[PDB]
Write a structure and sequence with these properties.
Strand content: 25-35%
CATH architecture: 3-Layer(aba) Sandwich
Keywords: NADP, Nucleotide-binding, One-carbon metabolism, Oxidoreductase
GO molecular function: dihydrofolate reductase activity; NADP binding
Structural class: alpha/beta
CATH class: Alpha Beta
InterPro entries: DHFR, DHFR-like_dom_sf, DHFR_CS, DHFR_dom
Helix content: 10-25%
Bound molecules: NADPH dihydro-nicotinamide-adenine-dinucleotide phosphate, 5-(4-chloro-phenyl)-6-ethyl-pyrimidine-2,4-diamine
Distance between the termini: 17 Å
Number of strands: 13
Number of domains: 1
Largest sheet: 11 strands, mixed
Organism: Candidozyma auris (Yeast)
Radius of gyration: 17 Å
GO cellular component, one term: mitochondrion
Shape: globular
């Protein structure tokens, strides 16, 4: 873990639902902007990585791919740890891409890496949130404020142990992501949402 490793996720409260019928139930435009900005913000000439499971890669519309200005890592158990002509890292485990990045001195095409973001897959989230190299969680806490009868029926969840983590102050979130970040509850449609940061509670 030379660069710091964040698990970045938007989770419905209180049970941390992250998906429904194979996709994301809410469209929150500013949450999107936050995701883009945080995962993209690096020192001049540096870059961040975004690590995702194959199904999340397939959910991303093709006009976004690879996610611009970031090192794309796709995890598939059939991958052969190859980098393609677009620069995308097709690796078979998080452990194997961490070893490869390390022997590269945590550089991508001569660009130092600043942060490594785990952006996706329930499967990937729930494996890696148990990897001790994960240094923090960037959790957008999403709240449904519409009518009970129209609440999303979440079917996939972040199985995270609250007790193993400690929420940090908003100032610490902003210091880490390198950006001013809206504080408190953001509103869009039937949803309220708040940006939060958590570190290990050892
Ligand atoms: N709310 C949020 O912030 C986010 C929500 N989501 C939601 O998550 C859901 C999709 O997540 P999920 O369906 O779990 O798909 P994932 O994106 O986690 O990718 C799953 C794939 O990852 C690969 N994989 C699984 N375990 C391993 C392993 N141990 N080593 C290497 N590769 C592995 C497999 O590909 P193979 O079979 O080829 O090995 C598997 O099919 C959707 O509902 C989406 O909306 C997604 C991202 C963020
Ligand atoms: C912008 C939504 C979003 N917000 C946050 N805070 N984290 C994420 N990991 C994502 C995300 C969701 C679905 C996909 Cl397919 C990719 C990324």
């Amino acid at each position: 873990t030379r660069p710091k490793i964040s698990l970045i996720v938007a989770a419905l409260q209180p049970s941390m639902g992250i998906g429904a019928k194979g996709s994301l139930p809410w469209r929150l435009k500013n949450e999107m902007k936050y995701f883009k900005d945080v995962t993209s913000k690096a020192k001049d000439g540096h870059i961040n990585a975004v690590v995702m499971g194959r199904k999340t890669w397939e959910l991303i519309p093709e006009r976004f791919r690879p996610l611009a200005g970031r090192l794309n890592v796709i995890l598939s158990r059939k991958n052969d740890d190859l980098i393609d002509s677009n620069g995308v890292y097709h690796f078979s485990s998080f452990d194997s891409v961490m070893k490869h990045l390390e022997k590269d001195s945590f550089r991508f095409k001569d660009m130092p890496l600043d942060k490594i973001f785990i952006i996706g897959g329930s499967q990937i989230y729930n494996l890696l949130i148990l990897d001790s190299r994960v240094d923090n969680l960037l959790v957008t806490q999403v709240h449904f404020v519409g009518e009970d009868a129209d609440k999303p029926q979440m079917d996939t969840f972040l199985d995270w142990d609250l007790s193993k983590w400690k929420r940090l102050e908003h100032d610490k979130l902003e210091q880490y992501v390198g950006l001013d970040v809206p504080r408190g509850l953001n509103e869009e449609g039937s949803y309220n949402y708040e940006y939060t940061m958590w570190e290990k509670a050892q």
